[PDB]
Design an enzyme around this catalytic site. Structure first.
Site, PDB file in Angstrom:
ATOM      1  N   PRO A  28       0.832  -1.237   0.000  1.00 15.55           N
ATOM      2  CG  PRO A  28      -0.089  -0.953   2.198  1.00 15.55           C
ATOM      3  CD  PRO A  28       0.974  -1.656   1.410  1.00 15.55           C
ATOM      4  CB  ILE A  29       1.623   3.628  -2.502  1.00 14.50           C
ATOM      5  CG1 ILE A  29       2.530   2.472  -2.909  1.00 14.50           C
ATOM      6  CG2 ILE A  29       2.309   4.981  -2.707  1.00 14.50           C
ATOM      7  CD1 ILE A  29       2.765   2.210  -4.376  1.00 14.50           C
ATOM      8  CG  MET A  60      -2.029   3.732   5.069  1.00 16.78           C
ATOM      9  SD  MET A  60      -0.782   4.307   3.912  1.00 16.78           S
ATOM     10  CE  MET A  60      -1.050   3.029   2.697  1.00 16.78           C
ATOM     11  NE  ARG A 112       8.675   0.962  -0.438  1.00 13.61           N
ATOM     12  CZ  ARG A 112       8.878   0.150   0.602  1.00 13.61           C
ATOM     13  NH1 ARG A 112       8.586   0.437   1.879  1.00 13.61           N
ATOM     14  NH2 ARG A 112       9.421  -1.065   0.458  1.00 13.61           N
ATOM     15  CE1 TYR A 124      -1.203   6.976  -4.690  1.00 13.45           C
ATOM     16  CE2 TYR A 124      -2.520   6.336  -6.611  1.00 13.45           C
ATOM     17  CZ  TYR A 124      -1.764   7.256  -5.916  1.00 13.45           C
ATOM     18  OH  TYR A 124      -1.576   8.541  -6.442  1.00 13.45           O
TER      19      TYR A 124
END
Lengths: 59, 59, 59, 59, 59, 59
Positions: A1-2, A27, A39, B6
């Site tokens: 996940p970004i 997150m 990230r 994302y």
């Protein structure tokens, strides 16, 4: 996940670093994802690159 | 401030709801910003739309 | 110039074509760029992928 | 509804304010959304950061 | 390094996998970064979410 | 097709040109799209705007 974060100019280096930590932990915890995998991208912009209801954030 | 996340498919609606709350409270605390001006966008994709070291997340 | 438009589901294809046309004219006029070089990208999402002060738009 | 605008460096602050106002208008009007809920983000880049068929815009 | 690719719907699973590979390889070579650290996101959209000169790409 | 590349500062203009070149050829060849329709955007950021597993890239 970004995560890509869009913030206005003016934060210290320390606040930006805290922001990366705390958002990554939120997150990891919410997504059930190893923290090392997360990230975080900060996209900074001047106050007048941000518009609210047709007007520049700098008003 | 605004966060764009994302993530890969598979999370339930209530899991996405936690994600939104928790990233938003993270941004509000880090930045010392009002929680009401935080916006969060979730950009979800198939597992094969995420590439890791040249390889689909879907291996 | 390029515009990426983040909108919630629920709009028809012809309201999306009107959206592409009017933003494209808005950019060409403001920036003095030929209308032919403007590119627009629509990034559509479910209502619950949009968080407003910690709450999904769906609520 | 949120718009992220990718433009090449070179415009004045008054041209950016116009772009924000007009693009916000077009979005409010096309989507049937209150103008006060429209957010616009300008992401400005140097000319050599934009490539067309494999070459920088700056050529 | 991260790449977000915006492509129109319709490409096969094998083509998307190839795309991820070859893009990743191109970033690793040019930037002199380990291929394992490269992340690639595909953002796919309907042909009519893409606007060229004020018109839907689909026409 | 459009590529948005997120890289850390510090590359020369000539490196960024190579990067644009090489990424555009991989997309055109993976997707067999006409190389001249490929658009590339570089979004460059400081080392401390890039978070890996909760820490700035700059450590």
């Amino acid at each position: 996940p970004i995560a890509q974060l869009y913030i206005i100019e003016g934060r210290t280096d320390e606040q930006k670093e805290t922001l990366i930590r705390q958002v990554s932990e939120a997150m990891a915890n919410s997504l059930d994802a190893p923290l090392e995998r997360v990230r975080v991208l900060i996209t900074e912009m001047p106050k007048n690159h941000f518009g609210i209801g047709g007007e520049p954030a700098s008003k």
